[PDB]
Design a protein around this nucleic acid. Structure first.
Ligand SMILES: [Br-]
Ligand SMILES: [Br-]
Ligand SMILES: [Cl-]
Ligand SMILES: [Cl-]
Ligand SMILES: [K+]
Length: 325
DNA sequence: CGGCGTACG
DNA sequence: CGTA
DNA sequence: GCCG
């Protein structure tokens, strides 16, 4: 079992779901306390279990697995022996965890803001609504739309939405294309946001495109909230006899960068962090969603495909549905 | 022990 | 600070 | 918390 998540296929559904969920509770709780290293270890350990070919039934099966040490192994041991891990349950029922989780679900609210509100004594969404002086306009929109944004969108919704986005994009710039990225490209049937990547086959024609797209979507009445090359929005999505708010991200890239942007926005979040860590630490190359830089030659690798990028990093190709780290 | 994605709004 |  |  290789040490980086980008070195191993990770499917969306797997054979260790309960174990991985428990470790991800501990990862989440570490992040709420600002312990990013511990968050990464617990996330990586969870992802190792997602990549295994069969269920873990005995503690011996953890021997030699990367990112399993004393703590993660004890968590698994307790789940295997008793069906529950006391540490995980203590986290689940703690006021700190429950409130930090609730607050960081709000669009516009990160750990730092949530922690500040927690220390100020706030605990519920209504607590925040009663103090609107404390909220940015972004947080006000996230709070108003929180209920809708808590419910998953289906792939059928995504497809109808893509058609709406494509019409606006085609008026903004004929020939420009829209590609579905994010979790739905990785095979999810349900999800909580929708990601689209926009480009044009003629290098440079995409300059200035995103404002033109947003203005047209706004004119069509589809934008419930928006604040360039990335737009993090709340869209109005049709529902039987009504509608609901959905989180939608729109990104523009020049076609020369499209393989890097697609690889970037397809995720998963942990996959991306692991891939960029691997690139820098193992290959000495600096990766982002624009390109791949050799700091010794001071050159950029001109990729024509995601397959090109994996080859250049010396990795076996992973299709998007095996990037669910 | 140091390191832990790398950007953009 | 927030977003991915 | 774990790797190297
Ligand atoms: Br590609
Ligand atoms: Br980036
Ligand atoms: Cl830490
Ligand atoms: Cl590292
Ligand atoms: K948030």
């Amino acid at each position: 079992m290789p040490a980086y998540a980008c070195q191993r296929p990770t499917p969306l559904t797997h054979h260790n779901t309960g174990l991985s969920e428990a470790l991800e509770i501990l990862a989440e709780a570490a992040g709420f306390e600002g312990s990013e290293g511990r968050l990464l270890t617990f996330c990586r350990a969870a992802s190792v279990l997602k990549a295994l070919p069969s269920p873990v039934t005995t503690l011996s099966q953890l021997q030699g697995l990367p990112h399993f040490g004393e703590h993660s192994s004890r968590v698994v041991q307790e789940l295997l022996e008793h069906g529950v891990c006391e540490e995980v349950e203590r986290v689940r029922r703690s006021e700190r965890y429950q409130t930090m989780k609730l607050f960081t679900q709000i669009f516009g609210v990160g750990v730092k803001t949530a922690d500040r509100w927690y220390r100020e004594g706030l605990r519920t969404l209504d607590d925040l609504r009663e103090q609107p002086q404390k909220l940015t306009q972004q947080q006000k929109a996230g709070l108003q739309h929180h209920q809708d944004l808590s419910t998953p969108v289906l792939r059928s919704d995504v497809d109808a939405l893509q058609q709406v986005v494509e019409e606006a994009v085609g008026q903004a710039l004929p020939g420009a294309t829209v590609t579905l990225t994010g979790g739905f490209r990785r095979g999810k049937l349900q999800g909580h946001d929708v990601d689209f990547l926009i480009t044009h086959p003629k290098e440079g024609q995409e300059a200035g495109l995103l404002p033109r797209v947003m203005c047209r979507l706004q004119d069509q009445g589809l934008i419930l909230y928006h604040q360039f090359e990335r737009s993090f929005c709340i869209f109005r999505l049709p529902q039987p006899g009504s509608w609901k708010a959905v989180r939608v991200d729109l990104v523009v890239a020049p076609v020369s960068q499209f393989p890097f942007a697609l690889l970037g926005w397809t995720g998963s979040k942990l996959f991306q962090r692991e891939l960029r860590r691997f690139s820098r630490k193992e290959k000495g190359l600096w990766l982002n969603s624009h390109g791949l830089f050799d700091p010794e030659q001071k050159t950029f690798f001109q990729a024509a495909s995601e397959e090109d990028i994996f080859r250049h990093l010396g990795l076996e190709y992973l299709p998007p549905e095996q990037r669910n780290a």
